[PDB]
Amino acid sequence: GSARAAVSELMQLFPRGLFEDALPPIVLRSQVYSLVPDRTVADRQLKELQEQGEIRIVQLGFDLDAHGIIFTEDYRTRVLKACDGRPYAGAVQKFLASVLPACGDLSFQQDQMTQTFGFRDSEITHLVNAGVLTVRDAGSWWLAVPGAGRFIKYFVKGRQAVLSMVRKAKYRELLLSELLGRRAPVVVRLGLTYHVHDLIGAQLVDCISTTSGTLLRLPE
Protein backbone atom coordinates (compact mmCIF):
# COMPACT_ATOMS: atom_id res chain seq x y z
CA GLY A 1 0.00 0.00 0.00
CA SER A 2 1.64 3.17 -1.31
CA ALA A 3 0.04 6.61 -1.19
CA ARG A 4 1.49 7.25 -4.65
CA ALA A 5 -0.28 4.09 -5.77
CA ALA A 6 -3.35 4.83 -3.65
CA VAL A 7 -4.05 8.25 -5.16
CA SER A 8 -3.50 6.91 -8.68
CA GLU A 9 -6.28 4.32 -8.53
CA LEU A 10 -8.87 6.84 -7.37
CA MET A 11 -7.77 9.13 -10.19
CA GLN A 12 -8.55 6.42 -12.74
CA LEU A 13 -12.05 5.92 -11.32
CA PHE A 14 -12.96 9.60 -11.78
CA PRO A 15 -15.67 10.21 -14.48
CA ARG A 16 -13.46 12.54 -16.49
CA GLY A 17 -15.86 13.13 -19.39
CA LEU A 18 -18.83 13.79 -17.11
CA PHE A 19 -17.66 17.33 -16.28
CA GLU A 20 -16.72 18.40 -19.83
CA ASP A 21 -12.99 18.51 -19.03
CA ALA A 22 -13.39 21.62 -16.86
CA LEU A 23 -13.16 20.50 -13.23
CA PRO A 24 -9.82 18.77 -12.62
CA PRO A 25 -10.33 15.22 -11.35
CA ILE A 26 -10.89 15.40 -7.60
CA VAL A 27 -10.10 12.44 -5.37
CA LEU A 28 -10.83 12.54 -1.66
CA ARG A 29 -8.56 11.86 1.29
CA SER A 30 -11.38 9.71 2.68
CA GLN A 31 -11.10 7.23 -0.19
CA VAL A 32 -7.31 7.36 0.11
CA TYR A 33 -7.62 5.58 3.46
CA SER A 34 -9.63 2.82 1.77
CA LEU A 35 -6.78 1.36 -0.28
CA VAL A 36 -4.10 1.87 2.39
CA PRO A 37 -4.98 0.10 5.70
CA ASP A 38 -2.66 2.16 7.91
CA ARG A 39 -4.02 5.70 7.76
CA THR A 40 -1.39 6.77 10.26
CA VAL A 41 1.18 6.56 7.46
CA ALA A 42 -1.06 7.57 4.54
CA ASP A 43 -1.09 11.15 5.79
CA ARG A 44 2.68 11.00 6.30
CA GLN A 45 3.39 9.84 2.74
CA LEU A 46 1.03 12.42 1.24
CA LYS A 47 2.53 15.12 3.48
CA GLU A 48 6.05 14.96 2.04
CA LEU A 49 4.50 14.16 -1.34
CA GLN A 50 2.60 17.43 -0.93
CA GLU A 51 5.73 19.55 -0.49
CA GLN A 52 7.24 17.42 -3.27
CA GLY A 53 4.98 19.42 -5.59
CA GLU A 54 3.26 16.49 -7.32
CA ILE A 55 -0.09 16.80 -5.51
CA ARG A 56 -2.56 19.47 -4.42
CA ILE A 57 -4.83 18.75 -1.45
CA VAL A 58 -7.77 21.18 -1.43
CA GLN A 59 -10.05 21.68 1.56
CA LEU A 60 -13.75 21.27 0.77
CA GLY A 61 -16.87 22.06 2.77
CA PHE A 62 -19.17 19.03 2.82
CA ASP A 63 -17.80 18.10 6.26
CA LEU A 64 -15.17 19.22 8.75
CA ASP A 65 -12.71 16.60 7.50
CA ALA A 66 -13.30 17.46 3.83
CA HIS A 67 -9.90 17.40 2.14
CA GLY A 68 -9.88 16.88 -1.62
CA ILE A 69 -6.91 16.06 -3.86
CA ILE A 70 -6.22 17.59 -7.27
CA PHE A 71 -3.33 16.52 -9.50
CA THR A 72 -0.81 19.37 -9.70
CA GLU A 73 -0.07 19.15 -13.41
CA ASP A 74 -3.75 18.76 -14.17
CA TYR A 75 -4.52 21.62 -11.78
CA ARG A 76 -2.10 23.76 -13.78
CA THR A 77 -3.21 22.72 -17.26
CA ARG A 78 -6.89 23.32 -16.53
CA VAL A 79 -6.86 26.78 -14.94
CA LEU A 80 -5.39 28.48 -18.03
CA LYS A 81 -7.91 26.86 -20.36
CA ALA A 82 -10.58 28.13 -17.93
CA CYS A 83 -9.15 31.53 -16.94
CA ASP A 84 -8.03 32.66 -20.40
CA GLY A 85 -10.59 34.71 -22.29
CA ARG A 86 -11.96 36.21 -19.08
CA PRO A 87 -11.33 39.48 -17.14
CA TYR A 88 -9.89 37.54 -14.20
CA ALA A 89 -7.30 35.82 -16.41
CA GLY A 90 -4.78 38.50 -15.53
CA ALA A 91 -3.37 37.88 -12.05
CA VAL A 92 -4.55 34.29 -11.76
CA GLN A 93 -1.63 33.50 -14.05
CA LYS A 94 0.65 35.26 -11.57
CA PHE A 95 -0.94 33.29 -8.75
CA LEU A 96 -0.05 30.20 -10.72
CA ALA A 97 3.53 31.14 -11.53
CA SER A 98 4.28 32.50 -8.04
CA VAL A 99 2.00 31.12 -5.32
CA LEU A 100 1.52 27.50 -6.38
CA PRO A 101 5.17 26.36 -6.80
CA ALA A 102 6.35 28.32 -3.75
CA CYS A 103 3.74 27.28 -1.17
CA GLY A 104 1.62 24.26 -0.34
CA ASP A 105 -0.44 25.52 2.58
CA LEU A 106 -4.18 24.85 2.47
CA SER A 107 -5.09 28.45 3.38
CA PHE A 108 -3.27 31.75 2.84
CA GLN A 109 -3.21 34.55 5.40
CA GLN A 110 -3.87 38.19 4.53
CA ASP A 111 -0.37 39.42 5.32
CA GLN A 112 1.07 36.31 3.69
CA MET A 113 -0.68 36.72 0.32
CA THR A 114 -0.28 40.50 0.11
CA GLN A 115 3.39 40.58 1.11
CA THR A 116 5.01 37.26 0.19
CA PHE A 117 3.21 37.06 -3.16
CA GLY A 118 2.95 40.82 -3.67
CA PHE A 119 -0.80 40.85 -4.29
CA ARG A 120 -2.80 44.08 -4.42
CA ASP A 121 -6.29 44.57 -2.93
CA SER A 122 -8.07 45.09 -6.28
CA GLU A 123 -7.11 42.06 -8.39
CA ILE A 124 -7.97 39.78 -5.45
CA THR A 125 -11.59 39.82 -6.64
CA HIS A 126 -10.50 38.20 -9.92
CA LEU A 127 -9.26 35.11 -8.09
CA VAL A 128 -12.58 35.05 -6.22
CA ASN A 129 -14.34 35.40 -9.59
CA ALA A 130 -13.81 31.78 -10.75
CA GLY A 131 -12.83 29.34 -8.00
CA VAL A 132 -9.27 30.35 -7.11
CA LEU A 133 -9.53 31.91 -3.63
CA THR A 134 -12.21 30.71 -1.22
CA VAL A 135 -13.10 32.48 2.05
CA ARG A 136 -11.81 30.91 5.26
CA ASP A 137 -12.24 34.14 7.25
CA ALA A 138 -11.33 37.84 7.25
CA GLY A 139 -7.62 37.08 7.52
CA SER A 140 -7.23 33.76 5.69
CA TRP A 141 -8.70 31.96 2.69
CA TRP A 142 -8.40 28.34 1.61
CA LEU A 143 -7.13 27.49 -1.86
CA ALA A 144 -9.96 26.90 -4.33
CA VAL A 145 -10.50 24.60 -7.29
CA PRO A 146 -12.60 26.21 -10.05
CA GLY A 147 -15.97 24.68 -10.77
CA ALA A 148 -16.11 22.65 -7.56
CA GLY A 149 -19.79 23.46 -6.98
CA ARG A 150 -21.35 20.79 -9.19
CA PHE A 151 -19.08 18.02 -7.90
CA ILE A 152 -19.95 18.34 -4.23
CA LYS A 153 -23.66 18.67 -4.99
CA TYR A 154 -23.58 15.33 -6.79
CA PHE A 155 -21.10 13.96 -4.24
CA VAL A 156 -23.30 14.76 -1.24
CA LYS A 157 -26.38 13.54 -3.12
CA GLY A 158 -24.58 10.29 -3.86
CA ARG A 159 -23.34 9.71 -0.33
CA GLN A 160 -26.84 10.11 1.06
CA ALA A 161 -28.22 7.81 -1.62
CA VAL A 162 -25.79 4.95 -0.98
CA LEU A 163 -26.24 5.31 2.77
CA SER A 164 -30.01 5.15 2.37
CA MET A 165 -30.12 1.95 0.31
CA VAL A 166 -27.61 0.27 2.63
CA ARG A 167 -29.96 0.95 5.52
CA LYS A 168 -32.99 -0.13 3.51
CA ALA A 169 -31.31 -3.43 2.71
CA LYS A 170 -32.99 -6.37 4.44
CA TYR A 171 -31.46 -7.08 7.86
CA ARG A 172 -29.45 -3.86 7.29
CA GLU A 173 -26.62 -5.56 5.40
CA LEU A 174 -25.72 -5.52 1.72
CA LEU A 175 -22.87 -7.52 0.21
CA LEU A 176 -20.16 -5.54 -1.56
CA SER A 177 -20.35 -7.92 -4.53
CA GLU A 178 -24.02 -6.93 -4.65
CA LEU A 179 -23.13 -3.29 -5.35
CA LEU A 180 -20.90 -3.97 -8.37
CA GLY A 181 -23.21 -6.63 -9.81
CA ARG A 182 -26.29 -4.41 -9.53
CA ARG A 183 -26.74 -1.46 -11.88
CA ALA A 184 -25.71 1.84 -10.34
CA PRO A 185 -28.66 4.04 -9.32
CA VAL A 186 -29.38 7.04 -11.51
CA VAL A 187 -29.61 9.37 -8.49
CA VAL A 188 -25.82 9.27 -8.03
CA ARG A 189 -23.76 9.94 -11.16
CA LEU A 190 -20.23 10.10 -9.71
CA GLY A 191 -20.04 6.30 -9.80
CA LEU A 192 -21.18 3.69 -7.30
CA THR A 193 -17.59 2.49 -6.96
CA TYR A 194 -16.48 6.05 -6.18
CA HIS A 195 -18.81 6.47 -3.22
CA VAL A 196 -18.41 3.06 -1.56
CA HIS A 197 -14.76 3.98 -1.10
CA ASP A 198 -15.86 7.20 0.61
CA LEU A 199 -17.87 5.61 3.42
CA ILE A 200 -15.06 3.12 4.04
CA GLY A 201 -12.73 6.03 4.70
CA ALA A 202 -15.44 7.92 6.57
CA GLN A 203 -15.99 4.76 8.66
CA LEU A 204 -19.74 4.90 8.05
CA VAL A 205 -19.33 1.22 7.11
CA ASP A 206 -16.90 -1.52 8.13
CA CYS A 207 -15.33 -3.93 5.63
CA ILE A 208 -16.43 -7.15 7.33
CA SER A 209 -15.03 -10.19 5.51
CA THR A 210 -16.91 -13.48 5.33
CA THR A 211 -17.10 -16.62 3.22
CA SER A 212 -19.28 -14.74 0.72
CA GLY A 213 -16.83 -11.95 0.04
CA THR A 214 -16.66 -8.80 2.15
CA LEU A 215 -19.61 -7.06 3.79
CA LEU A 216 -20.39 -3.52 4.94
CA ARG A 217 -22.46 -2.65 8.01
CA LEU A 218 -23.56 0.52 9.73
CA PRO A 219 -21.63 1.14 12.97
CA GLU A 220 -23.00 -0.47 16.11
Partner: protein, 50 residues
Protein backbone atom coordinates in the same frame (compact mmCIF):
# COMPACT_ATOMS: atom_id res chain seq x y z
CA UNK B 1 -29.20 42.92 3.01
CA UNK B 2 -31.33 40.00 4.20
CA UNK B 3 -32.69 39.33 0.71
CA UNK B 4 -29.37 39.69 -1.11
CA UNK B 5 -27.53 37.51 1.41
CA UNK B 6 -30.22 34.83 1.18
CA UNK B 7 -29.98 34.93 -2.62
CA UNK B 8 -26.17 34.74 -2.68
CA UNK B 9 -23.93 32.07 -1.16
CA UNK B 10 -22.82 32.43 2.45
CA UNK B 11 -19.37 30.91 1.79
CA UNK B 12 -18.34 31.35 -1.86
CA UNK B 13 -20.50 34.46 -2.49
CA UNK B 14 -22.05 33.25 -5.75
CA UNK B 15 -25.57 33.18 -7.16
CA UNK B 16 -27.22 30.04 -5.80
CA UNK B 17 -28.96 29.28 -9.10
CA UNK B 18 -27.27 28.93 -12.50
CA UNK B 19 -28.15 32.08 -14.42
CA UNK B 20 -27.98 30.65 -17.96
CA UNK B 21 -31.03 28.39 -17.64
CA UNK B 22 -34.26 29.10 -19.56
CA UNK B 23 -36.18 30.01 -16.40
CA UNK B 24 -33.79 32.79 -15.37
CA UNK B 25 -33.44 33.84 -19.01
CA UNK B 26 -37.20 34.36 -19.39
CA UNK B 27 -37.41 36.01 -15.96
CA UNK B 28 -34.73 38.50 -17.03
CA UNK B 29 -36.42 39.03 -20.40
CA UNK B 30 -39.70 39.85 -18.65
CA UNK B 31 -37.87 42.07 -16.12
CA UNK B 32 -36.05 44.46 -18.45
CA UNK B 33 -35.56 47.72 -16.59
CA UNK B 34 -37.59 46.52 -13.59
CA UNK B 35 -35.00 45.83 -10.87
CA UNK B 36 -37.67 45.46 -8.17
CA UNK B 37 -39.51 42.81 -10.18
CA UNK B 38 -36.23 41.06 -10.96
CA UNK B 39 -35.32 40.99 -7.26
CA UNK B 40 -38.77 39.68 -6.33
CA UNK B 41 -38.66 36.84 -8.87
CA UNK B 42 -35.04 35.91 -8.10
CA UNK B 43 -35.68 35.91 -4.35
CA UNK B 44 -38.87 33.85 -4.54
CA UNK B 45 -37.14 31.33 -6.82
CA UNK B 46 -33.87 31.08 -4.86
CA UNK B 47 -35.55 30.88 -1.44
CA UNK B 48 -36.32 27.19 -1.97
CA UNK B 49 -32.71 26.25 -2.67
CA UNK B 50 -30.99 24.90 0.44
Amino acid sequence: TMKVLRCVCFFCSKLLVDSNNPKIKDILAKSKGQPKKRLTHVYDLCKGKN
